[PDB]
Amino acid sequence: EVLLLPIDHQPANVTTPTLDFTNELTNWRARVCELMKNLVDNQRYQPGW
Amino acid sequence: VALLSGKYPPDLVTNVWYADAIYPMYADTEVFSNLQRDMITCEAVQTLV
Amino acid sequence: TLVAQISETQYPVDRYLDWIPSLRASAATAATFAEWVNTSMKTAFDLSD
Numbered sequence: 333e334v335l336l337l338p339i340d341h342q343p344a345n346v347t348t349p350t351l352d353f354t355n356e357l358t359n360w361r362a363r364v365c366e367l368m369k370n371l372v373d374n375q376r377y378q379p380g381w
Numbered sequence: 382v383a384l385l386s387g388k389y390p391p392d393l394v395t396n397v398w399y400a401d402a403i404y405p406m407y408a409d410t411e412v413f414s415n416l417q418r419d420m421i422t423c424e425a426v427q428t429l430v
Numbered sequence: 431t432l433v434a435q436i437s438e439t440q441y442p443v444d445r446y447l448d449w450i451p452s453l454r455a456s457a458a459t460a461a462t463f464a465e466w467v468n469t470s471m472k473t474a475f476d477l478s479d
Contacts, residue, residue, distance in 0.1 A: 344395060346456045347437070357384075391462040394453065 432467060433460060 353359045434443045436455050
């Protein structure tokens, strides 16, 4: 009587804020973007620019 | 791209939308025919052995 | 002030129109409503930019 899923699920509600970091997928996007800042913040890894 | 650009219709009601989707879908259902076919398949293999 | 009457915000405000029925509003609904407010004020004060 079960159907497995590869992600987490929650009850349906259309009044959910867009920037809700409780959401796993939204949180994933924020974490990746934050890392890319640290990579290009001090120009340590980008000579020749 | 699909993960970064998605939007609902500005006037959406879940009850209305899914009522109009299930009815055409369930009208042409074939589970009842499929159940009868499954009986024959199991009945046949036991005859073979 | 107007958006807070159809959604939930962080600003204190009084509500005088709740007996009038309304739908559950998503981000798409709020964006569409705000466009009409923006257009109305532009016409009133004769602005094109």
